[PDB]
């Protein structure tokens, strides 16, 4: 009880995840899919809905086509955006915001009307009596019950990363890069084409995006690991589709996620993980490198991949000093770490005065929240 | 016991020692070093300090901004100097300063207003029963239990000198001289880019400094020595920074050291220390000379490069006379001789009436300190 | 040199073949074999069991037509291996133990495809030399050019890809199944609205006759169905070969919009003015100026009456409005592919990459995806 | 007068090249080569692996931009052997043989930066004779003086020196990270706030460009953030390439205030006009007098408008309001290093200070360090 309950919600970007403060675990996953009907639509008293947003999408996705409004991070619909609010504060977690502090989370370097606007909405349409916003990166240290590290939080949507040492951030150290876990299930469809397989439809991209979470691996070599496929056919596994004709990947399984490393396969300039991390240690002071290489911090849902820790770890002492210790940290818990930490965060007595109020809100505006009171 | 115990503070200038009078060692050594934070600060729930100040500093100067109070031997930043004063009081010693008297120290030649302003704060702020001010290079003969002889105090604001004869001093044949052991660590850092090295944070200045302490030498001849390194690299060592990235060391060894006998390095005009401490002695009477060229004594921490002795007699005999003998005292202790004599003197019996007064500085004021009790 | 290189353009329902350093194709004849289907009485008539390229045309009203690749991909090899021996010692005559051939693919295909074709050639046919080469890449080499975007759209598929200053951007290719095939059975669906049935497959020719002689594609789509909705002025008449005439009315420019409406079938993706657009704002920002102004046109399916005029005007809706945009349609379309196959063939610094006998027998039919492609 | 001597300024970025005893350089170009970056289809093209200069700015869509110095260091030595034969033949188109050529170099340098260009020159090339200069002295030999003080800020690093009647003060001299490089990279990051990314190598030269035509310093910061808040008569427009203009608004200003606040990025050093504050306290009381009266600006990165007004305010708030304060800005800039350059290098008197290939051989490469510098 204590009548306060604040509100935790976590967009993203293709999962929505909600709950209130205080809480172990989200009481509300879904993802952030909004249809529309695509044929003629025949037949009388079927009494049928015009738009579905959430699971029902999902589960009706043969007939009408899916459509994402958050990308890279920054909202661009902002119709289909207060459908989706609408959806997890009524439907789901059935709940009245008249009554109820939300807190809400943003990337870094995003552009500034992004917070606006959604300021405005939260304050005129629902009406709540306070909020905040936070960046996702710094709540997955609240989680760890940590103070220093370097955290990479690798998503859907963006990666990026940022230091902290003993409770002061760097923001000349901060690193953003596009990469993320959208152009990973691109690829495995272009180079699915080359075994047989067609798959165009949006609704299409669910069934690729499947076999991703499934197969897909990360070897710990990729010159030798290539020679061993070549010759042998251990490293094939079968996957069902959901009319049948099942199928089978072979050395695909281990080229998707191996983008990260190589972002060359697609097109881009930049460098890998595992380079981007290194050139933000060698960003900050000299004395502070020593404890940001042994609390490095996986956090997010495309860092789950099987044999990425020890991946991450042989590419890392090849370019630090061969004096120091390297390791890295990776919860049993990685999808909901950022909501952890920010139901942690929402919860302490000295939190409760850092809350952006409706009267500052009319007073000052929506510009209020690039203020002290971010 | 006995209910007296006097107190003895050295402050120096970016080292303090402190402790009790009547024993063998100071209790307390850290830094006079006062830390402002530098970056953002995120994070919640951490409750840390605005400013640290002594040992605390040096552990966190990654993040923070390391500045010094007292410059050259004078106090620039009074607010600074209350900080400290209260953390080797309370914090360190911890002892209620109203019923201890101290002892206190000031280098010859200072303005005036600096003498005033110290006893304002002990007698007013820390309300002290009595207290007393010395000069450095007097205490540095009552550790080595003698009467006569010409004390070269160098430290690290300022380097100077005093001959004393059978309890008589001369004030008419005190030198001063600005190079100090601060000079020395910004000329090391200049040097140090000609092979590559960039060192210019000011918490970067503490990672110079360590390797002047380690490596640094006093040669015996310059101008055959550096033809030695120019051939054989048998004058180079290693040292490891902090994070790795070991580094090399080659003439710039002996060289930074070189500038107390030669100043034009740096642009100054004055002579060395060996002809500053020639012309005292000729400043003196005739035939108290003898007595004084065979009782050179050196004190202060930036007297302990290796083979320092050695060539301060090589070059003080090409001046003197060939007839009459020089040598040089060096006690294996330097850096505490100053405090050793300093506790040996609030032992005496005879001293317990040239204390201070509360009585006296309320009748007369802060003037009282240049009267006939200094 | 004497080497007398061929050439050859397999495609999907059209046979190019020919020699290297002429000017145009001397064989041309459709990929299609037919099988006898009714009782065959008679004695004497000394008869074949099946009859393949334009023996087949002929004969269509008693046999079945059957092609043997579908959107590109070649799915009956028993078949293919019977068209390719026509067109060697039939129709070209000449024997392949002296004579090296170049053979085209299409983008993004399986890649068990080019390995059959290898074995085939090396094995069956014994020919010294081979190669495949990419059909839109050679269409660039027709027009003596060096930079732009090529949309080749055939009877299988279209494809799409941007070439700036001979280096290529394999990350901005984009496929589309639609293609002629689907325009002529589209045409058979909106003719029963008038009452006419076509269901044979030896009708299928029919059909597509009309549609090369009469459809064409309107600059705009609302009103032009308000024009034709009232007056009667843009209706043809077309004379079956039995006889009993007919009339087009608003089907004759319906079938080629659904190139620019996809939805018209059931796909979902966009038409062909978007998809072009798409691969150009997925190059560079600096180099998309003069892909702009260097958009070539080839293949079969684009030589529709007024399709230049609507792709500039959808184009420059989306482009900004200060640069200029042109495309460039040559007089000739269909065998712009095959001119550039036969220009390629006879450059002196084109002799070092063919694929030799020596290196077949040494690595396999893998060799095909090394550096020599 | 078969002489002729050669003047080159390396730079960060730029290079200027040309003979001695003329007005203005001959080449100039950036010190850029670029590598291809993507497959490379297409025959008989006969297309170079590698280029440098000029040639690399037109066609730096499909290749990557690399810059062999850096904070005035060299760092890829197989890089600048490359350029320095670019512009001795191709475009100089001169032979080095008979030609003594003449160096600049920043202070407090690596001491192995010198000897390694002495190296290249006398065995790769053979020049006859050479010598390296200080670039901040050589300013003061294009303005015909002989005191004063010389803030000369490019691409890689800024630097100070005061010179009083032709004695310099080597322990008054000051050296700051922060240039024009540090101030592009600044302008990319705070670009993002309004949605537009360049993260590309090629795309760092579109933002380089917009700071050079569209920014400039502001008296002051406070209020003119103020009105910058408020009213939108402080925006322009910028058009790409491609087009999608674009506006600027308060960030117009922002980026050149980094020189005088440098903790935007982190640094923790001071801005430039406290660095040459104590570069004037640090010399002799009675000299202090000529050097304020005296100030010398010079380098690219000083032709922002307004930045004489500023520096003009910052100094006399922390100079005795007693003496005069003025700053010589003269119209030409980016070529001052140069213009001192060839007129050093025509002076009778200069011809014995050449470095002879006879001195290089009898004592090495250290030859440079010794009174011959
Ligand atoms: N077990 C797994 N293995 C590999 N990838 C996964 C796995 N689980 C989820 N993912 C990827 O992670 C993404 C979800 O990331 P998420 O944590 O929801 O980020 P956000 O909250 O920003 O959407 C999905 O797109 C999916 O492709
Ligand atoms: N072993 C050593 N060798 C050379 N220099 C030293 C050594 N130890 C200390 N120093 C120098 O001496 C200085 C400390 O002098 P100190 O005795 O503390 O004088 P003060 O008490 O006036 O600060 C430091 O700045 C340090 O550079
Ligand atoms: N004049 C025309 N107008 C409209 N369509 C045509 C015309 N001529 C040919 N076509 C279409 O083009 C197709 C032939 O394309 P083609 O160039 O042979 O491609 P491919 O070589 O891949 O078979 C035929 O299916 C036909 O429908
Ligand atoms: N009009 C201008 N306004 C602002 N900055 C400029 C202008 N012109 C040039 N610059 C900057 O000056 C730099 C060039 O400096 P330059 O004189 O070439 O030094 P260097 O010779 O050491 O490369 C470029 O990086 C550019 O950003
Ligand atoms: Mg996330
Ligand atoms: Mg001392
Ligand atoms: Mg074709
Ligand atoms: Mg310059």
Redo the contacts between chains.
Sequence with gaps: DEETTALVCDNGSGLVKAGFAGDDAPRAVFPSIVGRP?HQGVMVGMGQKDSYVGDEAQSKRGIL?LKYPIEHG?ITNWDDMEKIWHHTFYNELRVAPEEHPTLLTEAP?????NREKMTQIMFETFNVPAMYVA?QA?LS?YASGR?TGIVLDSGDGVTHNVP?????????AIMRLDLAGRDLTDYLM?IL????YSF???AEREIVRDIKEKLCYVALDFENEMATAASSSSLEKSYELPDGQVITIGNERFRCPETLFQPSF??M??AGIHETTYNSIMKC??????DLYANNVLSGGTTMYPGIADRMQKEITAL?????KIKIIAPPERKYSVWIGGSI?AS?S??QQ?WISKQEYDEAGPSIVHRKCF
């Design positions: 695509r086509t920054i370097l995003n552009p500034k009307a960046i710094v240290l103070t902290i040492y003993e409770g002061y951030a760097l923001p000349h272009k084409t080359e075994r047989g165009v439809t949006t697609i097109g300039e930049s002071d000299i004395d502070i490198r020593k630090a000093p061969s004096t120091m965060l302490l000295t939190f850092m």
